[PDB]
Design a protein around this nucleic acid. Structure first.
Ligand SMILES: [Co+2]
Ligand SMILES: [Co+2]
Ligand SMILES: [Co+2]
Ligand SMILES: [Co+2]
Ligand SMILES: [Co+2]
Ligand SMILES: [Co+2]
Ligand SMILES: [Co+2]
Ligand SMILES: [Co+2]
Lengths: 175, 219, 173, 175
DNA sequence: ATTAGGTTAGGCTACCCTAAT
DNA sequence: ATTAGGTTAGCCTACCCTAAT
C-alpha cells in the first residue's frame, strides 16, 4: 500500500483496463487500487484539472493525449524493469512484478534506453506483455498485468508450470 | 429533511413500527423516512455492524438489546420534549412534534431527569403516547380507531395519536383543525370503505393506512 | 466532539472572536474547535462558496451579511437556551453551556419567541452575555462564551484565582 | 526536487554528515536538502516521535538504533544501485548518483542480495564510498555530497579523476 | 432488497513555505 | 530554531441517490 506515485498508477491502470478490454471507470481504479470511492473520484478530478484525463459524458475515463503518453511511458518502464529484474538481476519471478510496480515510477528515460541496449529482445515483458512506446524512447501468449498481481491465483498458475481454473474475473486476464 | 442523527431516527422508527404493531422492514424505514432503498439497506448494514440491530432470517429488523435500549431512550426524550414544549414553553401544538423530532437527538439524560421534576405527570406525551423507559432514566391502552368504527356511528373519546400520524401533515393539520385534541368527544363511522371523525361539525377522513394510528376510548 | 452543525459553530465562533476583540483567523477556529488546519481551511472555503463569509486580503474572516445574520441567530439561540435551561429547567449551571451548545442548532425561531415570553428578562445569558439579534426575531459584567468552555479554570472561578494569559481578555466588567 | 521518501533521505543525510565528520544539525539537512527551516525541524519532530532519531541537548541529531539501522540500509541500497547502474546498466557516470538517489528508496532487500551475487566486488560504490551494513543483509573516495555538485564534479571529471581547487565547503568532501 | 457507480460534507496526516520573531 | 498561519496531495467514513436488476 503505497503507489509511490498515485497519478502514475492511476494512468497505468486506465491503460491496463484498456489493454484488458474493460471500460475505464472510476469504480475500476477504486477496486483495483483498493482505494475509497470519494478518494479516486477526487484524485481523478485533480488529474483532469491537469489535463491528464477527462471523464466522458458516460463516466468513462479518456486519457488526454498527454496523459496517454505518460500512461504508456509507465507501462513501458514497468515491463522494461521486469525484463532487467529477471534477465539480468535474476530476481525471483513472483517478486518481479511488485519490484517493478515500484521502479516504474523512479526509472529515468536514459536508464530505459541503456536497458534496451543491454537487453536481448525488448518485445515483451517476462510475462509476454508487449513493451509499449519504445518508438518514442528515441531508440500461452501472455498473462495480463492484472493477473500478475493476483498472488494466490497466480502462484497456483505457476505451480502448473505455465509460461488450474481461473476466477471468472481473472478470466479475461490471460491472453 | 435532516434526521439530525440518522441512526437514532432509524431505531426510533423500528421502535415506532413495533408500537403500531407493524413488522419492522427496511422498506418501512424507507418510506417512513423518505430515503432510497439502497440507502436504508446500507445505513442498516452499518448499524448491524455496530450490533445495534440484526436483519432476521425473514428480513425483519430485530434491535439488539443495546440497539433497543437506545431506541427507547430516544422515544422517551421525544415525548418528554413534547411535554416540555407544550406544558412549559407553550409552543404551537402542530410545531411541537417537529421541534421534538429534533430535540430528541440533543437532549441529555440530566435535562430529562430535571424535566421529570419540573413536569406534572410524565405518563404520556401531549398526544397520549406513553413515555417509555423512565426506569433507565432512573426515575392502559386505547382501541385503534380502525377497530372502533362501525356502519352506524358512535361518539367516543380520543385517547391516543401515534407519532406516525403526527407526521402526516395534510392529515394531521386537518384533524388539528377540526379542533380535535386528546380528550375530544368525537364521532366515528365506517361509511362506504373509509373511517372518518367529526369534532366540530368538521369531518376528517382518515387514510386507510392511518386508521390504525389512533387509539380510542369509550366516554 | 460533534459540532452538530459545523457551519453554524464556525460562524458562531467567528462571532465570538469578534466579541472577545480577537481577529477572526482560520487558525483561531482550528484551535478553538480542535480541528486540523487543512480541515478548517476547507470547511471555510465551502462557506465562502456559499457566500456566508470571505477570507480577507489579510486572511481575516469577514462574515457576509447573510453569514453574519446566521452567526447572530445562533448566538441568540444559545444564550436563550442557557436562560431557559437554568431559569426554567434548573439544569446544573456547568452543564448548561454544553447543552446549549447543542440546542442552539436545533431550536426554531418560534420556540425562541415563546421563550422570550415565558422568560423574565432576556437581556443577557445566565453568564451575563448580551442576547443578540432579538429584533429580527421580532421582539463583574460577563464571562465570555470561550471561558464557559474552560471547565477546569471555570469551576475554579465558580469555586469563588488567576486566569491563563489567553483567558485574560475573556472576563469583562 | 522529490525526496521520493523524506524520512529516508533525512536519515541518509544525517548518516552522510557523520561520514564527512560534520555534526548532524537540523541546519545541515535544511541546506543539503534545500528545504525551509521550519519544514525540516517539523519533519524531524515527526521522526523523533517515531523513535527514529533524537535531538540532543546540544541540538545535534542522534539517530536511534533503529533510525541508524535504516539510515544504513538506505546508504547501502544507494551505493549498491550505483554499482549496478554503472557496472551492469552502464548508465552515464554523472547521472548515476541521481538515479540511485531515487532507487535507494524503492529497492528491496532481495534485489540487493541478488545484486551482491551478480556484482563483482561490493566493497565500495563507483565513487569509492564503502558499501555499509552488508553484514546485516543476511548474506581514495569522493563523498556523496560531492557527487551531487554537478558543475564542480564535472570539472573534477574533466580532470580524469576516478576513485584542482575545491570550494572550502567541498574540501572535507574528498577523502 | 441488491448490484453498480456516484456524491457531498466533514476530518486527517505527511510534508513544504514565507514572515516575524 | 521557533512562532504563526496557511497550503496541497492523498485518504477515509457516514450518508444519500438514481438506473437497472
Ligand atoms: Co507486472
Ligand atoms: Co506501481
Ligand atoms: Co411526536
Ligand atoms: Co428526529
Ligand atoms: Co454559553
Ligand atoms: Co454548538
Ligand atoms: Co552516490
Ligand atoms: Co534519494
Amino acid at each position: 500500500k503505497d503507489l509511490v506515485d498515485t497519478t502514475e498508477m492511476y494512468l497505468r491502470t486506465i491503460y491496463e483496463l484498456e489493454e484488458e478490454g474493460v471500460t475505464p471507470l472510476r469504480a475500476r481504479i477504486a477496486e483495483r487500487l483498493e482505494q475509497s470511492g470519494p478518494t479516486v473520484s477526487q484524485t481523478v478530478a485533480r488529474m483532469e484539472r491537469d489535463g491528464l484525463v477527462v471523464v466522458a459524458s458516460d463516466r468513462s475515463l479518456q486519457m488526454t493525449p498527454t496523459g496517454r503518453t505518460l500512461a504508456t511511458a509507465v507501462m513501458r518502464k514497468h515491463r522494461l524493469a521486469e525484463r532487467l529484474l529477471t534477465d539480468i538481476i535474476g530476481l525471483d519471478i513472483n517478486k518481479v512484478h511488485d519490484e517493478a510496480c515500484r521502479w516504474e515510477h523512479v526509472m529515468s528515460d536514459e536508464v530505459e534506453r541503456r536497458l534496451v541496449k543491454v537487453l536481448k529482445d525488448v518485445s515483451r515483458s517476462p510475462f509476454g506483455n508487449p513493451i509499449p512506446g519504445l518508438d518514442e524512447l528515441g531508440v500461452i501468449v501472455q498473462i495480463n498485468e492484472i493477473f500478475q498481481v493476483e498472488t494466490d491465483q497466480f502462484t497456483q498458475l505457476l505451480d502448473a508450470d505455465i509460461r488450474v481454473e481461473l476466477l471468472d474475473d481473472l478470466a479475461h486476464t490471460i491472453r | 429533511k435532516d434526521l439530525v442523527d440518522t441512526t437514532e431516527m432509524y431505531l426510533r422508527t423500528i421502535y415506532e413500527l413495533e408500537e403500531e404493531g407493524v413488522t419492522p422492514l427496511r422498506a418501512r424505514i424507507a418510506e417512513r423516512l423518505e430515503q432510497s432503498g439502497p440507502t436504508v439497506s446500507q445505513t442498516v448494514a452499518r448499524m448491524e455492524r455496530d450490533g445495534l440491530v440484526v436483519v432476521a432470517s425473514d428480513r425483519s429488523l430485530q434491535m439488539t438489546p443495546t440497539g433497543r435500549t437506545l431506541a427507547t431512550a430516544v422515544m422517551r426524550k421525544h415525548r418528554l420534549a413534547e411535554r416540555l414544549l407544550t406544558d412549559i414553553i407553550g409552543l404551537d401544538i402542530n410545531k411541537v412534534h417537529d421541534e421534538a423530532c429534533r430535540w430528541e437527538h440533543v437532549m441529555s439524560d440530566e435535562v430529562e431527569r430535571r424535566l421529570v421534576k419540573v413536569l406534572k405527570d410524565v405518563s404520556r406525551s401531549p398526544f397520549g403516547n406513553p413515555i417509555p423507559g423512565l426506569d433507565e432514566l432512573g426515575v392502559a391502552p386505547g382501541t385503534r380507531v380502525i377497530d372502533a368504527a362501525t356502519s352506524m356511528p358512535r361518539k367516543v373519546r380520543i385517547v391516543q395519536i401515534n407519532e406516525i400520524f403526527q407526521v402526516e401533515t395534510d392529515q394531521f393539520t386537518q384533524l388539528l383543525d377540526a379542533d380535535i385534541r386528546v380528550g375530544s368527544e368525537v364521532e366515528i363511522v365506517d361509511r362506504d370503505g373509509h373511517i372518518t371523525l367529526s369534532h366540530n361539525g368538521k369531518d376528517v377522513e382518515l387514510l386507510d393506512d392511518l386508521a390504525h394510528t389512533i387509539r380510542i376510548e369509550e366516554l
